[PDB]
Symmetry: C6
Subunit: 323 residues, 6 copies
């Protein structure tokens, strides 16, 4: 069937390779050395002959690229153009100086040009590196993930036993704090017989304890809401929503309201209460919420969310809310 | 008259068989062995050479299909196209990677293609098997359906008598819990002299006690609201609405507010209170509810619903709300 | 003037006869025997060779039509097609499987086809028979219409004296309970010098005690609201609104608010209070109500409605609300 | 200048007489005898060979017209067409069976045709006779207008003096009660030095005490709001708004809120309180009121209206609300 | 530069003169004698051979123009046509019988024609004469502007010292009461070093104590809001808003909310509190206010307005609100 | 690489210089002497042969330009056109008499022409000079910036330490008070290791303590919301939003609600409380805020804003709100 399968994919593969190879070459040329670096979370070029890399230890390390032709205005613009085209977009110095796209393997990219940047010779690029490593929960415990807590042994038992039972857990905190890395490690305590369905923007979640699952990805014309809606027609036991953002908020609400089994999700929020308040906000941005009261929404989540885990800028839990 | 009926149906039957036979063959070809299985509730192929089946006992059973040509990419894709075309739709790797359709006999089907799936060689399919068996209420009793209740004899008498009198009953719980199977066995206590009108998507309700009845089905351009609206112009005694979903919620509301006799329906809700809240929500998503207060809607349902029955994940009633 | 009047109507009559005669023949062919039956309220064909008739005594009587060619698929489809065309509509197995229309003399008809009905050989038809008989109030008294009341002689005097004075009365209850038949009998106590204007969908109201009146009928492009609005420009003493349904609700509201004389109307409602609540609902579905509070509407009707009469399924008054 | 004025008006007069004379003849032909009658308030033909006239004493008088060619269907229809065309409209048995128009001299006219009327041979017409007579306030006093009041001398002094000072007065009650006739006689107490601007549909208000004034009439594309808006740009002292209807309500509100001197108007309301509620309602039907609370609107009118006068069906004041 | 400047304006001047001269001649012909009159505030022609002039002493003085050809229908229509054209409008007896325009020097004009006026030979015209005289504050004091006050010397010191400091003052009252004349006189107490920017419809404000200022005027396609918005980009010390009316209300609100320096404005209102209520009303008519509460708006103005001055119909202050 | 960079920029530079040089000459020609002046904040020409300059000490200084050809009407008009064309706009005496644009180096410019100005020979121009100087925090201290406070040493320590920790600070006051100059000097206390991203209209913020940063500018089709939205996809540590205006308010809100690190911004508000109210207002003008309560928005900001600093018209802090 492989031979017969190769002829089946021949046309579609060919079309991707023609569109992606120019971008694979430009990406390696400019950022190969940096994308090879260990424990990095972001790479940024500020348009001034210096590349800034952000380590997981919260430190920014600059690199001089003054003597490289890859950081020549014409090479940078080629790269930008390869990025836009890959996602069927355009980037120019008029109606499209800001561009959102992805590299060949999925990492998100943000490019800005003149007139939006300070001047003529300044091109701005920033790439976000996905969570590509899985640390076992045991590791978190050893690194003292729960030490800033008063009920350390109570937190560690609520998480493990809570998720085994299928409670709706939310992991929140600021960017690059470890939310995605954390939800991944706790998937250990989901029974191995559970059917799991994930909704992501970029492949990050790995399945090492489950054989019955399906990954769903959004982008371009397929929204997050589309996937979630499709997900409900695919009989899941658990639903892992990569991260909440906007209108998906409301659709998420109803999924908890139909009394559905254990949902895992990440979200940007400063604390438990800022979360319950943030869930109501994002939820109002979606049409089918107009006739619903803000207090009605906040009181809903507070009744459906079984536990919230917040993480500070030092990658440690400093609040373990439980209902 | 059968000779004349046959010539009357000649053109429509020919058009359906032309469009449905490519589908019947492909469906048999891939899932014939699985659709023959007993006591199943779902069939899922996760695009990785294994077919997962969900049994009524809540267990998933994997089946290896590595040495089958039916699960070859070209054969799967032929099946997907046959699924789309049957419902006058299209499925492709661009603007239509997600598809909702039905098999020849009604079972709902969900298909996802790349770029939404994880990759190029991954096609995801999931089929939902309808409630095709009728178990007599006596059977539920014997299986200990009400054993988890403090008022067992009181519940069993509220149901039998309540429904004989024509009270508005609702059965909620999660997917595959047995709500449809339950409302079916309960129809025994509806007087045989009652005209019954049902509204379903897939044929599931059988009539073994009633001779005066009409079934209405929705799909495509015909909404559930449409059938409900036609229903009211058909003079029913009882109305069985297969399952509440979005906009129908509000039309449902009015039918209760007009004093109408015993309505029976199913809903996805975690509990009595979550139901009263859920009915208010879905009811707000429909236009002619704009000027209505959420508190007005929730209390309206509370006064009109005579009794709610919730079912856990073990197929047992764990709450018998009565007004 | 009759000769000169016949030539005036010649063209319009001819056009109706060409359109209505095919329907007069098809109607007699299939349902003549049933439309001749005494004390019936509805006739239904479920598409299974049996015609069900509903008696005023609440009993359904089946009739076997297995040996009739009028109930042949081709004869049934002809009938359906004659119904649609008469109201300038279309009925088919695609975008128009549900049809609402009327027979030649006004009775409302509801036809449903495949794919909405269960299958290929099932055509559903249901005809509602209008109130065509007038029972004198005395009759209601003799049949014990008010016996289930604690203040029987008080009810009988409030109705008679109340309507003589011109109070806003509402008759409510479920379908086929006798609301229309009741409002008709009480018209006896409206002074014979009153100018009366009725708004109906189907001619049912007769005038045996009044000489100064005008009947108004709605349908197709002329809504109920249109008639009511026209009615207010025709100087009425009393207004008899056949039955409240939707947007007419609000227009009805203002008619009571301008402090207008005695209005009679029927409505589907389970009880007094469900009525005041139902009047507010229907009233919000009409645009010019957006800026009005639900409590503002309910409190209005409660101040303008002078008495409500509710009727149960046994055709007896079981609640006589008075303000 | 009259010779030059005549040539200036030649083309417009010719165009009006061409369009109005077919109407003057048909109107004379059918209703000449009835429009000559004294003390009438309405003329109705119910399509059944009888013309009903409503006298100021509240009695209806029938007149047999069975042997008149004017009430022949073709002659009635000619009259209807002449009515429609005069106001650049159309009347037919399809999309325009209901017509609102005016006779040559202004009287409003309402015409209804089949299918809206009961049948083919039924044409309904109703004509409203304007307040064409002025009775001096002294006459109202002599007829016992205020005899139903506890504070007779106090009412009669509040009116005379109140209006002399310029307070905002409203006259309400039902159709044909005498509100317009009342506000007319009351104008006696408005100082003769006041510039008065009126807004009517039909000419009814006469000026026997004032020399500085301008009349504004609305109809067709010119709304009441239009005239009110122009009015404010004409520097009035007093404003007489013939009668409040829909949207004008809100524009009316603002005029009171700007401190403007004594406004006089008529409204259809059952009582003082029903008026304050009715003004809030009609005021909400106009856009620029969306963001205004119903309680805000009701209280606004209460503080601004200086005195309301209600009139029963016997043409007597039965409530004299003063602030 | 004057010679070079004349050639620069040659084309635009020529175009205005061709459009304005016909109107300069028609205006002098009909109203020259009246526009020359001293202390007048309005001139009105009611279409009945009499011109009414309104003196500042509140008296209307009629003038007979029966023997003038300028008041011939053809001369009046020429004048009307010259007015419409000047503002690029049209005036006729169909879709444009109401016209708002201005004479050559700015005065506002309102013309109404048949069918809106009573009849065929009646043309209505009304011209408002702008405040063209500046009385020094001392004069107001001598005429006893503050005598009806209990704290006369307190009022006179609050106004003088308050405006010197830059407090937000509002002058209100009815038309022709002296609001504009009053704000003009108090500009004496604005420090002469202040940059002043006015927003007017008609030039009325004079600058006799300030050298650094710019006048802004609205009309046609340039709204009041446009000017105010432009004004905020022209670094003003004080802002004098000729008069508040509608949507400008809200824009005005924000200008006070950004904590901006001393604003002077006039408004039509019966009293202090009617003003705070009127400011909230007009403010809601502007889109960007939808999500703001009426009580939220009223409480805002009440916190930002430092003092209100109301004037009665005798040109005297009868209420001096201070916060 | 500079040779290749030059050829890469050849076409864009040529296009800008073609469009910008006519502007550089005209600008030099009229305002060269004034743009060279020290410590100015605005330049205004009021169309009357005098140029007004506003000095940092709040004084306006007039300069006579009567004998200059640059202020000739044709030369001023050439300059206006050059201003409009540079920003792809048009300025004329019809539909575009008001213009908002910028000079060659960024300074904002506002131009008004007749009919908006008082007359034909009057062209109004006003130029805003950007904060182009950086004064060290120590300088503010020496000038007595905090001397008007009761808690001087407490304010000076809350600022230094507060900002070092990353609290959300806001600087408000009126135009030209020194908010931008203040936030600039305060950046000293932001750790040098922080990645800073700024959003301005005109380049004003300098970076003398930070090496990792990116500037974003908005104008034309690129909104402030756009840059803020791109900003969040660039991984900043601190975000400096030049100044809050309309819609950005709400996007700003969310950024605070996501727990994001220390944001610094400027706003036009009279005081702390006026700010919290002002943030709620501007935030409501943006769509996705519809379903949010004004009280919900005001309290949201209060909990998230860590400290507000207001500045009077003498360039001194007169209120130091801390949470
Ligand atoms: N009480 C029961 N005992 C054994 N099997 C059951 C029972 N109730 C339902 N089932 C089986 O479980 C499956 C799911 O039931 P169904 O009524 O369709 O669920 P729901 O509508 O709530 O998703 C069916 O195939 C049915 O035959
Ligand atoms: N006080 C009165 N006495 C006798 N006749 C009256 C009196 N008031 C009104 N009428 C007559 O009654 C009719 C209706 O009066 P009108 O003022 O037009 O009523 P409304 O505007 O309230 O409908 C008129 O023809 C008028 O001449
Ligand atoms: N104090 C005063 N004494 C005499 N005449 C005045 C006085 N104040 C105003 N007037 C005159 O009265 C008229 C009132 O108009 P105006 O001042 O513009 O008031 P508003 O804007 O409120 O209509 C003007 O023609 C003005 O010249
Ligand atoms: N504390 C200060 N002392 C002296 N001059 C100042 C001070 N603060 C600001 N300035 C000057 O005043 C002008 C306006 O300051 P700026 O920060 O741009 O105001 P804002 O943004 O609030 O309008 C600038 O030209 C600046 O150089």
């Amino acid at each position: 069937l492989s031979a017969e399968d190769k002829k089946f994919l021949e046309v579609e593969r060919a079309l991707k390779e023609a569109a992606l190879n120019p971008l694979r070459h430009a990406t390696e040329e400019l950022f190969g050395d940096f994308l090879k670096m260990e424990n990095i979370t972001e790479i940024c070029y500020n348009g001034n002959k210096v590349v800034w890399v952000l380590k997981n230890n919260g430190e920014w390390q600059p690199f001089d690229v003054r003597d490289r032709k890859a950081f020549s205005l014409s090479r940078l613009m080629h790269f930008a153009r390869c990025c836009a085209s890959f996602k069927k977009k355009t980037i120019d110095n008029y109606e499209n100086p800001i561009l959102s796209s992805n590299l060949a393997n999925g990492e998100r990219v943000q490019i800005v040009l003149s007139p939006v940047t300070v001047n003529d010779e300044t091109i701005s690029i920033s790439i976000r590196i996905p969570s590509k490593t899985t640390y076992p929960h045991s590791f978190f415990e050893e690194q003292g993930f729960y030490n800033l807590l008063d009920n350390k042994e109570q937190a560690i038992s609520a998480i493990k036993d809570g998720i085994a039972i299928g409670k709706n857990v939310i992991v929140c905190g600021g960017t690059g704090s470890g939310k995605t890395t954390y939800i991944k490690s706790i998937m250990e305590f989901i029974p191995k017989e559970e059917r799991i369905i994930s909704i992501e923007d970029t492949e990050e979640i790995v399945f090492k304890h489950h054989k019955n699952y399906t990954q769903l990805f959004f982008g371009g014309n397929i929204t997050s809401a589309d996937c979630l809606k499709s997900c409900l027609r695919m009989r899941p036991d658990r639903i892992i929503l990569g991260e909440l953002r906007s209108s998906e908020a409301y659709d998420f609400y109803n999924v908890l309201c139909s009394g559905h089994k254990g949902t895992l999700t990440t979200l940007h929020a400063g604390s438990s209460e800022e979360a319950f308040i943030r869930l109501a906000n994002m939820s109002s941005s979606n049409s089918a919420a107009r006739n619903i009261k803000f207090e009605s929404l906040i009181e809903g989540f507070k009744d459906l969310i079984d536990m919230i885990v917040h993480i500070n800028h030092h990658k440690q839990c400093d609040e373990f809310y439980i209902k």
